A paper describes a structure:
Eukaryotic ribosome biogenesis is a complex, tightly regulated process that involves many ribosome biogenesis factors and spans different cellular compartments. Here, we answer these questions and reveal how the nascent 60S moves from chromatin to the late-assembly compartment in the nucleolus of Schizosaccharomyces pombe (S. pombe). In vitro, Fkbp39 binds DNA and nucleosomes but dissociates to bind nascent 60S particles and to partition them from chromatin through LLPS. This partitioning provides directionality for the nascent 60S to move into the nucleophosmin-rich GC, where its biogenesis continues.
We analyzed the isolated Ytm1-containing nascent 60S by cryo-EM, which revealed 3 major states in both wild-type and fkbp39Δ cells—each state can be further classified into multiple substates. Among other differences, the RNA domain III is flexible in state 1 but stably incorporated in state 2. In wild-type cells, ~20% of particles are in state 1 and 50% in state 2, and in fkbp39Δ cells, the populations are ~65% and 15%, respectively. To gain deeper insight into those biogenesis defects, we characterized state 1 in more detail. In the wild-type dataset, the majority of particles (~85%) had density for Ppp1 and associated proteins (state 1B), whereas in the fkbp39Δ dataset, only ~55% of particles in state 1 exhibited density for those factors. Furthermore, in the wild-type dataset, state 1B showed the N-terminal helices of Ppp1 stably incorporated into the nascent 60S subunit, but those helices were less defined in the nascent subunit isolated from fkbp39Δ cells. Our data indicate that Fkbp39 is required for the stable incorporation of Ppp1 and of the Ytm1-Erb1-Ppp1 complex into nascent 60S particles, which is essential for ITS2 processing and the assembly of the RNA domain III.
Numbering used by the authors:
A (entry chain G): 69 to 120, 125 to 235
B (entry chain t): 50 to 215, 232 to 249
C (entry chain m): 213 to 258
D (entry chain o): 102 to 238
E (entry chain K): 5 to 29, 41 to 262
Amino acid sequence: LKVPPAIAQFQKTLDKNTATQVFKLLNKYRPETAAEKKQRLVAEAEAVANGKVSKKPYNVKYGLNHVVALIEAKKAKLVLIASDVDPIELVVFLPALCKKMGVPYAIVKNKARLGTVIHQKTAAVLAVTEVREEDKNELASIVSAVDANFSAKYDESRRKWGG
Amino acid sequence: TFKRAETFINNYRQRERERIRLNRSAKNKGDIFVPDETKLLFVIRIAGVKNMPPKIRKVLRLLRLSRINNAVFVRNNKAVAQMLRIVEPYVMYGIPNLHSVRELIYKRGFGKINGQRIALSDNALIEEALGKYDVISIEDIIHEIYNVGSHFKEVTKFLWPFTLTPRKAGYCGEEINELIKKQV
Amino acid sequence: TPLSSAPEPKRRFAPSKHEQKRILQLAYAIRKGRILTSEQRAERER
Amino acid sequence: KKKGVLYVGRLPHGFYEKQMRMYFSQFGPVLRLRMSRNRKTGSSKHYAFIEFESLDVANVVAETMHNYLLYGKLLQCKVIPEDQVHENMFKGADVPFKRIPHATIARLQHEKPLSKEKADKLITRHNRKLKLKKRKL
Amino acid sequence: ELLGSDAPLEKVCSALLEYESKRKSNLLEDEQDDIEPVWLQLATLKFIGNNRKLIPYKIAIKNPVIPSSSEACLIVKDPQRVYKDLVNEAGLSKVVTRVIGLSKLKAKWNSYEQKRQLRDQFDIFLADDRVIPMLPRILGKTFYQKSKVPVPVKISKGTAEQLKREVVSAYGATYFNSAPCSSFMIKCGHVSNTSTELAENVESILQFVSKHIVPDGAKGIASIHLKTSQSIAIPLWNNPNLKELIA
RNA sequence: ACAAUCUUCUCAUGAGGUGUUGAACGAAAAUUUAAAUUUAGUUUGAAAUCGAUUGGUGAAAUUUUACCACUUUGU
């Protein structure tokens, strides 16, 4: 058949170098594991039991409903969509929603790579909303690359029927 | 394989980093640390990074570190310190305790007689090659190397760059024995 | 502009009450000895 | 067939003539390599002109290596058409930049005493410099 | 006197100030207390510096050149909280706007855009002696070329009255970056200061110059001139016996 | 391997600390000996379409230094 433009736009993913750079920044903001989080809580629990303030965390945002609500909140600075969601309808609107709400987005390879970042088997989509001040330049540099290598590229190919 | 552009820049940054440290430590910082507690060390090579500064390249060769992990009996004094400090980012220097040198000589001892790895298994080999050097056995080799005897330089030449394949880029002291214990 | 005009809750500007609930019930087990403390567990591994 | 000249801009610091030559050689032959360098200290002006043996391969490198996120810099690799290419656009290509230490050379000049007559010429010149301000004030 | 028994101070400062004042010829939202600086250029018979020493010279003088209303930024070693507490109890918060730890300066300010933003924010950058060798990097030409050289202010012990004495010392003392040359220029003050202070600020500079930068002192000094950014370099003193010194 | 050693001070009481993206605009002074340095200043995206300074020094085996800088390149 002839793939519609909204479904063909997923075949033109993000390239080697930019994806590797994107995942390098994501891996500095991975969420905290279930095994580690318990250790952090029992450390704080033991501190309060013997005798007795912290800072807000900084981790990448995941979850389809959570991220879509972050795009519509104009909070997400970068949205990374898996290219192989089994029901494609789950993300078929995400590129158009990101275009409408002025968010930089990219379609990257494999849900597992996004899944690995957040200690899950699979992640449909990932969003970066806030980064540490030390890495504001790195996120800004990556977003520029996504604009140049994903949004500036293709562009016309996402409006043409695929296949 | 296809080398990516970042590797070439990474080589330049390390080179400039390597060049800088060499310029500071050598020129206007002629002061040296002068390692002590022995007259003999067991310097090993951590990793000679590719495209060394041309100064570096012989410092491995002359003090016998041409290959990685090459543990050698070097006469511990002020003279080796500046040269070692030239190559200190790629080496670990440490003291060959008598047990470590004996254990190395007993099993891993492959003395570079005629430039080839000649095993120190037979005490006659030490006795015959180092008869004028007073080293007569593997135990006498430790006396001539670990205790740095009168002919330690000749014994070291008789000895080999023992590849103590496993490390900090500097002082080890007894830690060379720790690597030797695992290596041998 | 954002899509929702719902006011921001205070909870997002404060330390989480989820872990505060979890910390308090971890403390209770530490007090009652149900949970081996980090020092006791670490020294038990030796 | 016709030489394919590649303008590589926004060069990350370190990606210099030797480094460009090894990297760009994998795509295709680089007849000669020229990077713009500063007037005095010869520091990179971050854009180089890389003419390949043929336009075709240079087009491949231009496509492959455009907007390359390198060391936090978006690399700009454009095939410059020959019409804007001039005779000395690749002048002194693959020729080492012997940075002349102008500052120390004048320091050696400072260390070098003038000839006694030429030193007296300086003293009179300072006297000229002294009397030039004389009617100046 | 002083240099070669012929330094005509006082009168030269008054004459230069009068000459500058003679050259006098909406902006209410574009006005401040800026006064044209006073410039002292020194000529030496030989290149004093081997290379650019990117630290200022603490030329002590009791007539400040930097106005006391200027904003100062302290660059201190870790932890940042300790010295943030120190400036809090010493009452220097109004004077010293920000205190920046070295790690936070190396991380939060990496782009040149951020570096220039920080540079324009404050006027004088005070730095602890304990970490001043780093500031060559991390800051770069955005600072050491656009007249923003951090000053090594001695705060190692970290006490309230010590902070006050060093900040006052830093504010009052004029500053200059040594570079390899036979000539260099010194900040003496502004047109606002009276001529007597400039002459006395000037003489304090030469005696410091003859001591800690010029090795042979007044013997190696070629000439002394007084200038304003748009004025004539009026010669304070010229060497009367430099003929055989250079021979 | 887009990872590496650019400086928590040092001595001595003084001296040092070896270190700055490029490009554009701009004073007006000095010495050094027009270029050479300093030299009011500046502006900007780690910005980028020729313009090169053009000698020396070694330091390997004359081409090689893409910083080797006169204190001037393989212990």
